[PDB]
């Protein structure tokens, strides 16, 4: 009838139903001894491990419970984290280099989840002795490998790896500077006449340029069979001699298969004049390609992509099939707004009371290892917002430019 | 007196650019050379009905374009064939041939176009009990006329020479005097190789050091001495121009509305 948290049901030796049970059966049953036999409400007995689960009436010596007045767990919502104004780079740099709002959350959440070694070799901490560097568009964060180390792949360190920088722009907040152009090549120009020899203005005239560009592709499979029965045979005929006569019937079928497809851009430009009676108006259009710059601000929400990548240890990991070969895991989650449900914690954390949309990573393991509030807090510093002002500058090749002119009128 | 003290740096400068204050864009006449004809319409517009109308119209269109294509075709075949020498009723001795075959073919095609278009259109209102003549006219033509504007001037600048053994600024601090090409865009942003106030801002960075190290030739000169330098280097340009348009083969064209007949 209502949902059950698993992290919430309580055994004891001195009440849940067997709906209830059979919704998350495998979290009961799995915290359980193998042969061992506890009771339900109102007359039901679940079975461990052994009897496969197994739900039946009966009666027990102890009994599964679940709280009067439970709580839900959510993750709490914190305060928008300030970075001083500057370009992206600035800005994202200023991110990374926080140890205590990030080094150490980010750090936190992949020791939690099962990856071995986060951590360098000057501190026996977890996220202590971190060292930052930038690689192509993005950041990496990994611990410290100059000194020695004494583990198991103790040298094998797991990475933190930040990219994908995105902005939610205040709606008020944009501006943008003088746009300049460069390198200026022409495609085409006209120039003409609007006459008004009537008594009444007129404002009846069009005249219209358009460029257009395209490209195309295609490929194309084919098979086929033949068969031929050829026959020769020799004859004497009349004043020719002896002829030779051959004869040949042939049939052939083929099969043919095709895709392909096209791409096209458009340009146009139309200028319309209302001209005055008795008189005449200049007209002129022009194209050209150009290389555009310009200046812009704003002020904005930062999401990203965060990516760990690590080897998962033996003795236990949160990967919802627990592996234990040590093998090498790369997994990424969308900071910020929903795109799917592999990279959303939010979207996992509140389905982990449906067994069937365990699909990645295994929430009620992190929460029995670790404390409920230890989870909820870990992931609340984890998303916590953040907010900068942005300067930048932008700038395209190849794009186009025009101008559109009505001139002054006259007289007839 | 020198190592290939005739090996000397050259500094090129070239693509001069201009911002346009908005409000100092003037042209001249414009006059027309070489003109031939397309095509051109006549007709009228007629209305007897009793109040005034605005209902019609008349349209001119020119179009032109060009295509291209490649195409690559690659293939297999394979046949068998027995022959065999029998005797037949009433023919006699026959050569008899069977032959069975198959085959297989691939093929990949790429391609492209441009089209340019202009159109003109004529559309009266036209008085009750009344006609109206219009026409429309086509050329091509070669167009020409005068300008003048105020503006800021930005240009690229190119350094050609070798780099000293003794110490250079390119981050690979290479030694052996190899023959350098380097562009820089004295003016507004485009790129990051090109730009020295990007590279300038951002030498505290390690990562972004791709192209020339700042740090060092602030050690070897000074703070203040490149400050300075790279002030003037950068410093502002502004002029006034003067100039002349010119083109072959553009349009031109001419719609007329003529006076009411009464009916």
């Not at 100059?146 to 040298?155: L, Q, T, V």
């Not at 150009?290 to 930062?302: G, N």
Request: hydrophobic fraction near 35%; charged fraction near 20%.
């Amino acid at each position: 009838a209502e949902p059950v948290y698993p992290d919430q049901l309580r055994l004891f030796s001195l009440p849940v139903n067997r709906e209830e049970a059979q919704s998350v059966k495998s979290n009961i049953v799995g915290m359980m001894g193998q042969w061992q036999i506890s009771g339900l409400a109102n007359g039901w007995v679940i079975m461990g491990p052994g009897y496969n689960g197994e739900i039946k009436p009966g009666t027990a010596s102890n009994t599964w419970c679940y709280p009067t007045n439970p709580v839900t767990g959510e993750i709490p919502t914190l305060s928008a984290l300030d970075i001083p104004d500057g370009d992206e780079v600035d800005v994202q740099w200023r991110l990374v280099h926080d140890s205590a709002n990030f080094i150490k959350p980010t750090s936190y959440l992949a020791h939690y989840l099962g990856y071995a070694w986060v951590g360098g070799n000057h501190s026996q901490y977890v996220g202590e002795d971190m060292d930052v560097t930038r690689d192509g568009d993005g950041w990496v964060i990994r611990g410290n490998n100059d000194g020695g180390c004494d583990g198991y792949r103790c040298g094998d360190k797991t990475a933190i790896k930040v990219s994908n920088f995105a902005y939610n722009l205040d709606p008020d907040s944009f501006k943008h500077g003088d746009v300049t152009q460069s390198d200026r090549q022409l495609v085409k120009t006209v120039v003409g006449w609007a006459v008004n020899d009537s008594d009444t203005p007129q404002s009846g005239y069009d005249v219209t340029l358009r460029y257009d560009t395209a490209t195309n592709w295609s490929k194309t499979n084919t098979y086929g069979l033949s068969e031929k029965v050829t026959t020769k045979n020799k004859f004497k005929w009349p004043l020719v001699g002896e002829t030779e006569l051959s004869i040949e019937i042939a049939a052939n079928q083929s099969w043919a298969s095709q895709n392909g497809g096209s791409t096209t851009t458009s340009l146009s430009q139309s200028v319309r004049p209302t001209v005055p009676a008795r008189s005449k108006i200049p007209v002129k259009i022009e194209l050209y390609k150009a290389d555009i710059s310009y200046p812009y601000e704003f002020k904005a929400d930062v999401s990203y992509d965060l990516t760990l990548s690590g080897f998962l240890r033996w003795g236990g990991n949160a990967w919802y099939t627990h592996p234990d070969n040590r093998p090498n895991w790369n997994h990424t989650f969308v900071i910020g707004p929903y795109k799917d449900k592999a990279s959303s914690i939010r979207y996992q954390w509140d389905k982990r009371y449906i067994p069937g949309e365990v699909k990645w990573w295994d929430w009620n393991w992190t929460i029995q290892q670790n404390g409920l509030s230890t989870m909820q807090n870990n992931l609340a510093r984890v998303l916590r917002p953040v907010r900068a002002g942005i300067t930048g500058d932008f700038s395209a090749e190849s794009q186009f430019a025009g101008n559109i002119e009505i001139g002054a009128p006259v007289p007839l």
